[PDB]
């Protein structure tokens, strides 16, 4: 019944399916197979090299399958045909798909999403453009080949005895059409040779996702032991609904999913609000509606006061919009295909959404609610095509006495002035001219660099984009008068647009801006970006300060989704709160110069009036304002992007003359022929006569933009501030037209999203309708467009920032991708990467996902990540050595490595991954391992992994390779401005001082600081990192052949360091019967392994324990502008270990200033270090990421209440030592709660026998003193802790 044996058998059968005839053994930690490749052999043969048997090494291997190389068997990867053993199911979805195929004659090249275009055996010029489009927009990426996923689906279907529809259509396709394409393992983005249709990889990805969701819903259903899901009092089947969705969305996947994702969310938001009895969970916090101190009592049912209101016209139109939206999508899907099916269950359920009650305390409804929001996860990353369009000024709304545009501009200008004053109040000010040449590195994270720079390295020329290299090369030219007085509105100067994908929606466009525009923007906008980062403000409408109103930046500060968003649960639990959410459409489009830009410019202009006495190299501030924003600089600018092309015949190009055939500078796609201008394109373009495509090349189709840009340095602040103005106008108008009906209690502004918590003083339908009409009338006259179909106005349901709450309980939606990925990634560090995915899977399972399927997915992924990526090394007689010889007789062979799945459950430091089989939130560590093996209950769980330890080879990791083999030829010309006067002082000397600059500072020394900074900048660039990756194979060979099968479990540590193994010095007792009363919690959709933890231990109701000494060091280091991105606390402590702690404040100030730390941070760090050295122990605690995941953030652990309740420890211990105890205590108590053990208090015990006390004293003394290193650093033993340890335990 243990998961460790079932998963082992599962993955074993998957491995034997993937590689037939495998010699895989469960009891061995690794396996090695050979693979043969002929691609290098051919290219060697064309140089006339002589080889032995050519295709024989193919034919003899594929057929007989018994040839051996140095005794190690050689196998070939299994064919596409036999992945599902040739079974068929004649599924209707297959004919639905093949009916949706389209010939090339119906091409619309400007399509956002590609349709199901057929692939012909012969070639044509338009098919080249189709191939070019498909290669880019149809990439899967990810980290695991799709065939491995298909094998896993087949095996798990065999295990669970159920047949997903996705596997059915998969088998139906492969039974006749054989391979879809070819994918390489060394680089998964090499998809090539499309066989049948250009949209096949989308089919495979969607079918695997659908099968994963079908498995997950069935296993989660079995966990709760329910027979069917429930809607009201009616039974419903989830797999039926999922198949019903899947069959309909298949004609045109991306478009249908994008147009259909909204009604499903609206139904979930609107479910159960109008029921006569309502079940709510009590929650109580502070007076403010954004208090974060909630606590939960119990459930109750209450009558609904709002029941009579739901006969309103507004709700009827809201429902009717969604019925039209579902029906038009169904009609389009039926028309494109050859089917007459529809969505009967969903339209049946939509008919009575209001009156059917919602039951948060019944899992049959909560699972359904969570599943409907997670359905949309089958069309990830939504790559799309975008077109360049100008500003079209004619449709802009002119200000007239019937609108509110001038009022919006005036109020937003007043808000800029007020916010600037508020930022000045918080000692945040604009940059000073003394800081002009050093603050340019402080650009916001949404910024982008316009011009890429060229670097010579020693030999090779390369290009780079990141701010550091471009600035360090050409920063002095940024402010020069030549670059200031130029405008980007002609052919000679222009800027290009980029694009980045998003997980579900269409690809988002971004703007690249030259640094000469960004820096003047930064000069003014830096203090406001700094100031608005703070949290915890008051959001009452009658409060003067506007700092707390903006929620931008007030997200993920705690780090837990459930913890920081508790106001949603609190407001949804309150019957007296009415919540309103306005959803705008094309917000960034409607920020015009009539309403937004001019008032903002005026706010900045009369903002800098008190600073008019300052000058910047002759220029004054109001000239810098025009430098940052102005015509030809930000507004009224030309922009380049995707080309525009038109449909013509072939021979029309032949009748053209050479004036229309002149090819310009701009590049054109593969399958399109050039043409001079767009005018001749309009003359020649013919619609019915599709034979060829032509694209203009003279630059007449660039975009003219006079609208707010997403790449600017103040986009979020401006957007939220504009929304503040809009909300002020909305409140003013609703107060004026309908006095006293609606009172605003809280207003919330983040991005384009707006939220209101208000009190409604009436239940009459006609008053509510007039109020809603007034709101929509006001927002319409204001210039924007507000959709009445998405705008939400509800008593009991609250949504913000993709977070949903219904009746005081958390309804999670899961959008975490598992198969695909946003961009291609290369795994520099396998172990940290697997750590990252297991951390993300913790979040996924915390969002309602099944725990066992998560374990199975990690069990799969832990085996195949390291495979296929080692090369130019061969193994013979258990010895690794370089690839054969110069004989070139076995040159075509490579070695592939397969890891034991159970390596997922062996701790870090033992070459493994720190996951725990009992629950994923517990981190394996050596002490945790020995504790688990000493527990008698876990033996059956721990039995297989007992024999798998001490067999794991070292993991692939290119990150620790650090050498000097990347000498650059380009130099740091701007160094004369980057170096602090501390650095600038020690380079004017005639090398006399050079010989006395012998402090142990390492690479940060005068005469070498510039080179080391440049070197680090290159190592930030991956295209520069790729040069040193060649030599890492030899070091990996050294790591392999230096490995010895031995487990060390060194519970000691480096004497400067302390870890959680320290608690293993003492024995641990469990006594006392604690209270068994269960606690309440809002998230009622968890796995039982997590549910037991959330019930035994309540939610966190306080701040976590005080930050560590390293945390304080990092916070102090977060004050230096130029070194925050270059200095961590580890870098400081590494220098300190050689420098020593026995120094005065002046010594440390001088040392830090020499290390490019500015003198104020130097003084602060020196004083704090002196205080810590004099007062406390000062040892840094190393933790294995424990208590750092998503779920542990929400538990009542690692807090002072937790220590006071659950822990009793001797008083002789120090604060760092008791913290090291406390983390182990949290881990142990979490593990005991997970196993269902009785709740008992835990104590650390020290016995009366003398010999144990002698060893404890010896160990503590050797731990607190770094032995012979006391000579190196001359640390005075007169520090309080070490001097006090003389007779602590005597």
């Amino acid at each position: 019944v243990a998961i460790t044996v079932q998963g082992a058998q599962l993955i074993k059968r998957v491995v034997e399916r993937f590689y037939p005839g495998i010699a895989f053994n469960i009891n061995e930690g690794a396996c090695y197979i050979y693979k043969f490749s002929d691609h290098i052999r051919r290219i060697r043969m064309k140089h006339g090299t002589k080889y032995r048997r050519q295709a024989e090494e193919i034919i003899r291997n594929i057929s007989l399958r018994k040839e051996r190389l140095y005794g190690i068997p050689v196998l070939d990867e299994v064919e596409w045909k036999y992945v599902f053993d040739g079974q068929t199911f004649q599924s209707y979805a297959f004919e639905v798909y093949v009916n949706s195929i389209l010939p090339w004659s119906e091409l619309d090249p400007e399509e956002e999403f590609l349709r199901n275009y057929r692939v012909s055996r012969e070639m044509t010029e338009v098919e080249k453009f189709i191939e070019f489009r498909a290669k880019n927009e149809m990439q899967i990426y990810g980290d695991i080949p799709i065939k491995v996923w298909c094998c896993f689906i087949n095996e798990l279907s065999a295990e669970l005895k159920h047949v997903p529809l996705g596997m059915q259509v998969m088998a139906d396709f492969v039974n006749r059409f054989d391979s879809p394409f070819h994918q390489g393992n060394r680089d998964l983005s090499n998809l090539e040779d499309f066989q049948v249709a250009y949209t096949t990889p989308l089919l495979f990805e969607m079918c695997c996702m659908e099968s994963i969701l079908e498995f997950n819903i069935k296993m989660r259903m079995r966990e709760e032991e329910i027979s069917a899901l429930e809607f009201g009092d009616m039974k419903v089947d989830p797999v039926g609904l999922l198949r019903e969705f899947f069959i309909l969305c298949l004609p045109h996947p991306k478009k249908i999913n994008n147009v259909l994702r909204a009604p499903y969310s609206w139904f979930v938001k609107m479910w159960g609000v109008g029921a006569d009895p309502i079940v709510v969970l009590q929650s109580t916090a502070g007076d403010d509606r954004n208090s974060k101190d909630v606590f939960y009592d119990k459930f109750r049912t209450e009558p609904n006061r709002y029941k009579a209101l739901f006969r309103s016209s507004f709700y009827n139109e809201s429902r009717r919009m969604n019925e039209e939206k579902i029906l038009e999508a169904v009609k389009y899907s039926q028309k494109l295909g050859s089917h007459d099916r529809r969505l009967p269950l969903f339209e049946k359920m939509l008919k009575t959404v209001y009156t059917t009650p919602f039951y948060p305390h019944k899992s049959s409804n909560m699972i359904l609610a969570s599943f409907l929001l997670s359905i949309q996860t089958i069309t990830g990353y939504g790559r799309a095509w975008v077109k360049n369009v100008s500003t079209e000024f004619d449709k802009q709304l002119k200000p007239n006495p019937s609108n509110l545009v001038q009022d919006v501009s005036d109020l937003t200008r007043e808000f800029f002035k007020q916010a600037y004053v508020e930022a000045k109040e918080r000692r945040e000010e604009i940059v000073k001219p003394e800081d002009l040449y050093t603050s340019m590195l402080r650009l916001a994270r949404n910024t982008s660099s316009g011009f890429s720079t060229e670097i010579y390295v020693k030999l090779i020329k390369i290009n780079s984009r990141i701010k550091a290299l471009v600035i360090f090369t050409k920063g002095h030219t940024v402010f020069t008068d030549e670059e200031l007085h130029k405008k980007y509105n002609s052919v000679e100067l222009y800027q290009t647009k980029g694009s980045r994908d998003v997980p579900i929606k269409a690809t988002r466009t971004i703007y690249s801006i030259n640094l000469s525009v960004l820096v003047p923007q930064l000069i003014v906008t830096l203090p406001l970006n700094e100031y608005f980062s703070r949290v915890g403000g008051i959001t009452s409408p009658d409060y003067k300060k506007i700092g707390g109103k903006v929620i931008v930046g007030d997200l993920e500060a705690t780090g837990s989704r459930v913890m920081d968003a508790a106001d949603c649960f609190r407001n949804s639990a309150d019957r007296d709160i009415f919540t309103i959410a306005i959803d705008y459409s094309e917000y960034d489009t409607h920020l015009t110069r009539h309403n937004f830009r001019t008032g903002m410019l005026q706010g900045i202009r009369e903002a800098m009036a008190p600073y008019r006495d300052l000058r910047y190299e002759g220029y004054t501030l109001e000239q810098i304002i025009d430098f940052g924003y102005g015509e030809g600089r930000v507004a009224n600018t030309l922009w380049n992007g995707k080309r525009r092309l038109f449909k013509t015949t072939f021979d029309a190009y032949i009748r053209l003359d050479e004036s229309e055939r002149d090819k310009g500078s701009f590049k054109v796609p593969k399958g399109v022929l050039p043409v001079s201008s767009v005018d001749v394109a309009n003359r020649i373009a013919v619609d019915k006569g599709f034979d060829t495509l032509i694209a203009a090349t003279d630059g007449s189709d660039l975009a003219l933009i006079d609208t707010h840009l997403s790449g600017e340095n103040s986009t979020l602040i401006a957007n939220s501030m504009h929304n503040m103005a809009i909300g002020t106008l909305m409140q003013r108008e609703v107060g004026r037209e309908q006095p006293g009906v609606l009172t605003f209690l809280s207003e919330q502004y983040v991005g384009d999203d707006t939220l209101f918590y208000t009190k409604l003083h009436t239940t009459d339908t006609k008053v509510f309708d007039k109020v809603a009409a007034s709101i929509f009338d006001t927002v319409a006259k204001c210039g924007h467009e507000a959709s009445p179909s998405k705008t939400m106005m509800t008593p009991y349901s609250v949504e913000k920032t993709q977070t949903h709450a219904k009746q005081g309980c958390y309804v999670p939606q899961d959008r975490m991708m598992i198969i695909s990925s946003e961009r291609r990634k290369d795994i520099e560090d396998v172990q940290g990467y697997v750590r990252s995915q297991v951390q993300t899977m913790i979040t996924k399972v915390s969002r309602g996902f099944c725990h066992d399927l998560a374990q199975l997915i990690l069990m799969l992924k832990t085996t195949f990540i390291g495979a296929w990526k080692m090369k130019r090394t061969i193994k013979e007689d258990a010895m690794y050595r370089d690839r054969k010889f110069d004989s070139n007789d076995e040159d075509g062979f490579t070695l592939i490595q397969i890891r034991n799945p159970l390596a997922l459950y062996v701790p870090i430091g033992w070459n493994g991954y720190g996951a725990h089989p009992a629950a994923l939130n517990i981190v394996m560590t050596e002490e945790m391992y020995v504790d688990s093996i000493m527990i008698s209950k876990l033996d059956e769980i721990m039995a297989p992994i007992r024999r798998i330890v001490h067999d794991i080879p070292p993991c692939w990791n290119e990150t620790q390779g650090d050498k000097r083999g990347l000498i650059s030829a380009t130099k740091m010309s701007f160094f004369s401005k980057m170096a602090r006067p501390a650095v600038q002082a020690a380079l004017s000397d005639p090398q006399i001082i050079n010989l006395v600059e012998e402090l142990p500072l390492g690479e940060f020394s005068p005469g070498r600081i510039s080179r080391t900074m440049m070197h680090s900048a290159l190592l930030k660039e991956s295209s520069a990192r790729t040069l040193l990756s060649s030599g890492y194979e030899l070091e990996y060979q050294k790591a392999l052949n230096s490995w010895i099968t031995q487990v060390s479990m060194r519970l000691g540590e480096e004497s400067g360091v302390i870890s959680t193994s320290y608690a293993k010095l003492f024995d641990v007792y469990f006594e006392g019967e604690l209270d068994g009363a269960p606690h309440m919690f809002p998230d009622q959709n968890l796995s039982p392994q997590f549910y037991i933890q959330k019930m035994m231990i309540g939610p966190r109701v306080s701040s976590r324990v005080r930050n560590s000494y390293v945390d304080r060091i990092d916070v102090i280091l977060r004050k230096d502008v130029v070194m925050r991105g270059f200095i961590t606390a580890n870098t400081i402590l590494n220098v300190i270990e050689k420098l020593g702690t026995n120094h005065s404040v002046g010594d440390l100030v001088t040392v830090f200033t020499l290390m490019n730390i500015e003198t104020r941070v130097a003084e602060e760090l020196a004083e704090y270090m002196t205080s810590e050295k004099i007062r406390f122990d000062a040892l840094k605690l190393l933790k294995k990421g424990i208590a750092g995941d998503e779920f542990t953030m929400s538990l009542n652990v690692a807090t002072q209440d937790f220590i006071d309740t659950y822990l009793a420890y001797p008083y002789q211990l120090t604060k760092t030592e008791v913290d090291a105890i406390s983390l182990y205590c949290t881990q142990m108590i979490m593990l005991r709660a997970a196993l269902g053990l009785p709740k008992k208090k835990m104590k650390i015990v020290v016995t009366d026998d003398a010999k144990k006390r002698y060893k404890i004293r010896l160990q503590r003394f050797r731990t607190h003193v770094p032995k012979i290193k006391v000579l190196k650093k001359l640390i005075d033993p007169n520090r309080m802790t070490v001097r006090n340890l003389e007779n602590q335990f005597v």
């Binding site: 019944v1 032991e225 459930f299 305390h361 019944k362 899992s363 009992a918 008698s936 209950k937 876990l938 033996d939 059956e940 769980i941 269960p1078 039982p1088 392994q1089 549910y1091 037991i1092 019930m1095 196993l1235 269902g1236």
Partner: peptide, 20 residues
């Protein structure tokens, strides 16, 4: 004695019955 999911499931069914 060996661990099983049965007792954890029993406890969560008990608390859901209490909720009912």
């Amino acid at each position: 004695s060996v661990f099983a999911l049965q007792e954890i499931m029993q406890k969560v069914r008990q608390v859901q019955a209490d909720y009912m």
